[PDB]
């Protein structure tokens, strides 16, 4: 890793543990035990009890049906995009651009009103986040492939 400072640290710890004596009080303290119990108590950091408390009844099923429809549409569009990939012919180059344009139009048409409705109802779930992740990944992949295509022509 680093320079001979690693060997210096090894020698230092060897000397430190050369004279080793067991301890009792220093091992645990009442404050440390209380903090550990609070962390391990229900509702704590490691025992997070929320985890979308009533997501089955949160974000009403009217929105849930629309969310499922958006998921299906995005899945179909991405399936078409990945079927087009990889682009081995110049014909597919325009098809991927058309698919990207369709994805952007669908996003603007549906997800933006979807995001507005979610913000109006102030739903705590980040339902849009996963959809954005897939769309962002597809856009990044297309941009990377276009960059490669430009580099191949250099």
Partner 1 sequence: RNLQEFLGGLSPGVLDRLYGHPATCLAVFRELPSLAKNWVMRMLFLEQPLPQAAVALWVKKEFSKAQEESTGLLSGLRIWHTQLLPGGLQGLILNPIFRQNLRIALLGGGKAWSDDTSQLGPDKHARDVPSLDKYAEERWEVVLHFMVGSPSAAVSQDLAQLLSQAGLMKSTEPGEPPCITSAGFQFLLLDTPAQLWYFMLQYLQTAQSRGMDLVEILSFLFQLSFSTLGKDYSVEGMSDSLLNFLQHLREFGLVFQRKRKSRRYYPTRLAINLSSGFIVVETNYRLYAYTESELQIALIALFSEMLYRFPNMVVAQVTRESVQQAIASGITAQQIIHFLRTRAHPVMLKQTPVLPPTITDQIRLWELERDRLRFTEGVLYNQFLSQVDFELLLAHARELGVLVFENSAKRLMVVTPAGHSDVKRFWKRQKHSS
DSSP secondary structure letters along the chain: --STHHHHHHHHHHHHHHS----SGGG--HHHHHHHHHHHSTTSSTT---SSTTTTTSS-HHHHHHHHHHHHHHHHHHHHHHHH-S--SHHHHHHHHHHHHHHHHHIIIIIHHHHHHHHHHT--S-HHHHHHHHHHHHHHHHHHHHHHHHHHT-
> Is residue 37 at the binding interface for partner 1, with CB under 8 A as the rule?
yes
Q: Select from 6, 13, 33, 72 the one that contacts partner 1 (CB under 8 A).
A: 33
Size of the site for partner 1 (CB under 8 A): 12
- Please state the closest distance from residue 112 (CB atom) to partner 1, in A: 44
Compare residues 15 and 31 and give the one whose CB is closer to partner 1: 31
Q: Does 28 bind partner 1 (CB under 8 A)?
A: yes
Our finding on whether 26 is near partner 1 (CB under 8 A) is: no
Q: Is residue 34 at the binding interface for partner 1, with CB under 8 A as the rule?
A: yes
Comparing CB distances to partner 1, the nearer of 9 and 34 is: 34
> Token pair 């299906």 is at which residue?
72
> Site for partner 1 (CB under 8 A): which residue of 8, 29, 52, 65?
29
Residues of the shown chain interacting with partner 1 in the complex, contacts defined by CB under 8 A: 22, 24, 27-30, 32-34, 37, 41-42
């Amino acid at each position: 890793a680093t320079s001979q400072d690693i060997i210096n640290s090894f020698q230092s710890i060897r000397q430190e543990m050369e004279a080793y004596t067991p301890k009792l009080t220093q091992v645990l303290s009442s404050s440390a035990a209380s903090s550990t119990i609070t962390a391990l108590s229900p509702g704590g950091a490691l025992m997070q009890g929320g985890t979308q408390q009533a997501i089955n009844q949160m974000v009403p099923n009217d929105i849930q049906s629309e969310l499922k429809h958006l998921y299906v549409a995005v899945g179909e569009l991405l399936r078409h995009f990945w079927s087009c990939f990889p682009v081995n012919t110049p014909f597919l180059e325009e098809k991927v651009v058309k698919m990207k344009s369709n994805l952007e139009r669908f996003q603007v048409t549906k997800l933006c009103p979807f995001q507005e409705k979610i913000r109006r109802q102030y739903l705590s779930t980040n339902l849009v986040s996963h959809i954005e992740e897939m769309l962002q990944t597809a856009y990044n992949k297309l941009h990377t492939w276009q960059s490669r295509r430009l580099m191949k022509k250099t």
